[PDB]
Design a protein around this nucleic acid. Structure first.
Lengths: 103, 220, 107, 127, 62, 25, 84
RNA sequence: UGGACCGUCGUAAGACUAACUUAAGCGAAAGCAUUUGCCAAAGAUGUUUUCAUUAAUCAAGAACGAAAGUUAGAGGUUCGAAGGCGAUCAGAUACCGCCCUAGUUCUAACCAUAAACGAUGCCAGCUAGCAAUUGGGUGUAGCUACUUUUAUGGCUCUCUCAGUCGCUUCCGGGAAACCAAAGCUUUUUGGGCUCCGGGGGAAGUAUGGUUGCAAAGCUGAAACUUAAAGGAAUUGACGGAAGGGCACC
């Protein structure tokens, strides 16, 4: 929450971020997930452990990650008309559901 | 910091408010001001308060219908758990002001700004509507704007005379029975027959001084 | 293909008529083309009246009501279903129906 | 014997307030709301929470000896809604059925003479 | 909060996912409060019913 | 497509064609 | 019925309430009364739709009433609705 | 953090004129709502007043012209193109959420457009009801006000102008939807007058002239392309729209 105005509003905006995420997980919530869609292949970052695995390894690979996610074995060892109507098969799901409770 | 170990309301002492002399019984509520200190003066925070009461609470009205004259009083001078609470204006409650304005009518509203013989300089907000006649099948009953700007003058030359008008020892007694809504109706019915007329609001923007001598006489 | 005799609503010899913000989408819709609803609704809604009049001080006091003239955009009173989709021979009526009782939502 | 504070119940969309105070209005008694009673950040508006606000104030003013009250609704109408929300009737039922024998039921919601330009902008809040 | 209540009149059941008879029901010691509660499951007229939450009824018209 | 946004697809040619033409003088 | 055989001679009373212009001729509903005020004596002849405060030179009693169309004498009238 | 939000009284500000509010009025169209004073103006009616065709419509021309925009000066509340965030999403430079900048507002000019719509130029006559309804006129053989039975004022009834809005119908027209004019455009039709259209595109483009600080405005083609494009209405979805009514595929 950080009512402390002698802490940086430009840096507590992320202290409000990564601590509201861990507090909800500390009570009941699932760890936050972000799916790294590299080249026609996915990589789900579900737990904190694979999330914390992921962060330090891209301090070494970094900008060639997508060309090393598909090619490097040892990184892959560590981490282990037809189109529109499927792209709108799911948008019709939201509008029907994100609008039934709209009032 | 302050950091009182329990209950700043325990510092708050009750004060009994008292109405002025003209209405009825005086005790009409209880204010809760902190017990005084060196830099907390119990006299000093009471002076600003504008207190809201109804007229039915000041005229022995057991059945609330004539309550709509919300005579706001100003907590003026204190002594010994007893503020004296001078007069500060009179709204009209919104259950009764908003009820009158139906469509199918033309309302006429006059606003004056007249000073008493006492130093107060009021501002009275009269309200009219046009009364439907009997056997009037026509569903409007509208006035004609020289039958409005007449009436808007016809109220303004009247309720100025009640302001220079046996003042707040007696002017609020004219507001006790609402006599001023009775002088308007007979004097406007020569022009256009008006519906229910009430003055709805007075503003007491220029109170001069104390005159505690007459004020303690005003606390009879 | 003209749908209404009066087009939108009711603009007879004024040239142009002032707008009004719709009550729940804040859309600038004009004054005559505005679905005006005018509610006089009780303040306890009919079930706390038997509960307030226990803890009344007076002889039942009788309780006040609300007074507001609500305007609606045409979508925001088809979606709220104040007003829907009359037939082609019943787009021509303005005067009926209630036909059943005193109308509720006052009550 | 009888003593009269007021209630100032402010019942809007998303939140409800019950703010019992002096006959002036200044010195408050049991400021609390319904938004400090349900821990969800959407549930603040519920009639449960307006009771759960008024289940606390209506006893607390009794601990300050308050016997009787006046009621002042609010909507929150500025340019805005100008009708009390869902938990307005949930409070006065909860307040009066806790032995606070009251009479004055007024509605100080603000009502302006065509004031300024509410947000949304001319087509606004497209959903 | 061990309040009991018996039904005087059924109203419609909003069934489809949670069949419950929104029914008008008065208490025993506080029989002047004919509140309109929502009772999941099959009920009969004049059926007495236990309760704790006897304060507000989740108002829904018909 | 819209009859209005093609009035702007073309009004912003007429100042590329008026700019480019009169720099070449 | 619009298929009447006759349009030339109307009934008398309806052409007395047709218009001043829309009758079969034009005829004004004006005339020249001869007002004597009851408070004085002088024979004064005036227009009916007078539009002028017309009291006598030595008899300024009432003689008329100021209004738009025909002047409407109230309780101060003595004239004759006739050629003088 | 101890004091936001709330309560309260108070001060300053700029914006806006609710409710009354209409099928109500006024205006050349654009547009036009606090009181009051002023200021010139105007339609209507009343008119046994005057003048005696002074008229109609109009290429060129002239004035006025919502919003946005521009030049300078003020102010600057809320809202707020752009901008930056927060989300949302497969992506979202969007909708939703927060911050605000030009703008919004006032005088000084410029711009000269809009679904500037009644998608209906203007002056004149005729062809039917009925209901309201704003002005003004007129008769109560009406009530009512009390200043009094009165009289001024209100209402109701009756008539009439100038109308306006609705319905009802053609027993007129139309491709129809409809229209009391979109009718009397009849059978090869005629009350005057002006502006405009000629399959769809290309294209309000290209180029010249002309106006503007500029944005832009007025004028304005063709080569080429093409057989349809369009109007109104019927029948197909008790196919993501209301209101119904069923069954354990």
């Amino acid at each position: 929450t950080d009512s402390h105005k002698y802490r940086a509003k430009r840096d507590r905006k992320a202290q409000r971020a990564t601590f509201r995420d861990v507090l909800r997980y500390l009570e009941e919530d699932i760890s936050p997930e972000i799916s790294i869609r590299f080249g026609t292949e996915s990589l789900t970052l579900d737990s904190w452990s694979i999330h914390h695995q992921y962060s330090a390894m891209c301090t070494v690979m970094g900008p060639g990650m997508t060309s090393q996610l598909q090619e490097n074995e040892f990184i892959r060892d560590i981490f282990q008309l037809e189109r529109h109507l499927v792209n709108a098969a799911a948008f019709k799901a939201r509008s029907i559901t994100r609008g039934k409770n709209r009032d | 910091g302050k950091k009182k170990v329990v209950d700043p309301f325990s510092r708050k002492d009750w004060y009994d408010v008292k109405a002025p002399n003209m209405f009825q019984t005086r005790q009409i509520g209880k204010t809760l001001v902190n017990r005084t200190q060196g830099q907390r003066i119990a006299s000093d925070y009471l002076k600003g308060r504008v207190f809201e009461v109804s007229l039915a609470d000041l005229q022995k009205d057991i059945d609330p219908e004539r309550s709509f004259r919300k005579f706001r009083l100003i907590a003026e001078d204190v002594q010994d758990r007893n503020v004296l609470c001078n007069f500060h204006g009179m709204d009209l409650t919104t259950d009764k002001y908003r009820s009158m304005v139906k469509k199918w009518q033309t309302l006429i509203e006059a606003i004056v700004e007249a000073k008493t013989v006492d130093g107060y300089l009021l501002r009275v907000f009269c309200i009219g509507f046009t009364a439907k006649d009997q056997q009037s099948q026509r569903k409007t009953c509208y006035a004609q704007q020289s039958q409005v700007r007449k009436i808007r003058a016809r109220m303004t030359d009247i309720i100025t005379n009640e302001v220079s008008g046996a003042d707040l020892k007696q002017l609020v007694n004219k507001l006790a029975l609402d006599s001023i809504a009775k002088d308007i109706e007979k004097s406007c019915q020569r022009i256009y027959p008006l519906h229910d007329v009430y003055i709805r609001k007075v503003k007491v923007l220029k109170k001069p001084r104390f005159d505690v001598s007459k004020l303690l006489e005003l606390h009879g | 293909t003209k749908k209404r005799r009066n087009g939108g609503r009711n603009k007879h010899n004024r040239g142009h008529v002032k707008p009004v913000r719709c009550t729940n989408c804040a859309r600038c819709v004009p004054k005559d083309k505005a679905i005006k609803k005018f509610v006089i609704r009780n303040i306890v809604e009919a079930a706390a009246v038997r509960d307030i009049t226990e803890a009344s001080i007076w002889d039942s006091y009788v309780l006040p009501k609300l007074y507001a003239k609500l305007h609606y955009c045409v979508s925001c009173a088809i979606h709220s279903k104040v007003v829907r989709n009359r037939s082609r021979e019943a787009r021509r009526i303005r005067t009926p129906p209630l036909r059943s009782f005193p109308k509720d939502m006052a009550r | 014997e009888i003593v009269f504070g007021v209630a100032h119940i402010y019942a809007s969309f998303n939140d409800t307030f019950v703010h019992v105070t002096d006959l002036s209005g200044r010195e408050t008694i049991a400021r609390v709301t319904g938004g400090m009673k349900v821990k969800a950040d959407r549930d603040e508006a519920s009639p449960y929470a307006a009771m759960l606000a008024a289940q606390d104030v209506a006893e607390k003013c009794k601990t300050l000896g308050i016997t009787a009250l006046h009621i002042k609704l609010r909507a929150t109408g500025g340019n805005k809604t100008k009708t009390p929300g869902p938990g307005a009737q949930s409070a006065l039922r909860a307040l009066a059925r806790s032995s606070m024998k009251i009479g004055r039921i007024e509605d100080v919601t603000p009502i302006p003479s065509d004031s300024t330009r509410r947000k949304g902008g001319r087509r606004g809040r497209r959903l | 909060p061990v309040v009991w209540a018996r039904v005087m009149k059924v109203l419609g059941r909003t069934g489809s996912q949670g069949q419950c008879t929104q029914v008008k029901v008065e208490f025993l010691g506080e029989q002047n409060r004919q509140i309109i509660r929502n009772v999941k499951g099959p009920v009969r007229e004049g059926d007495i019913l236990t309760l704790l939450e006897s304060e507000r009824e989740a108002r829904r018209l018909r | 497509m819209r009859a209005k946004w093609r009035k702007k697809r073309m009004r912003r040619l007429k100042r590329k064609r008026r700019k480019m033409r009169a720099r070449s003088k | 019925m619009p298929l009447a055989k006759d349009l030339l001679h109307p009934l008398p009373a309806e052409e007395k309430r047709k218009h001043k212009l829309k009758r079969l001729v034009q005829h004004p509903n004006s005339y020249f009364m001869d007002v004597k005020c009851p408070g004085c004596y002088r024979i004064t002849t005036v227009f009916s739709h007078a539009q002028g405060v017309v009291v006598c030179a030595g008899c300024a009693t009432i003689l008329c009433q100021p209004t738009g169309g025909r002047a409407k004498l109230t309780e101060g009238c003595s004239f004759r609705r006739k050629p003088q």
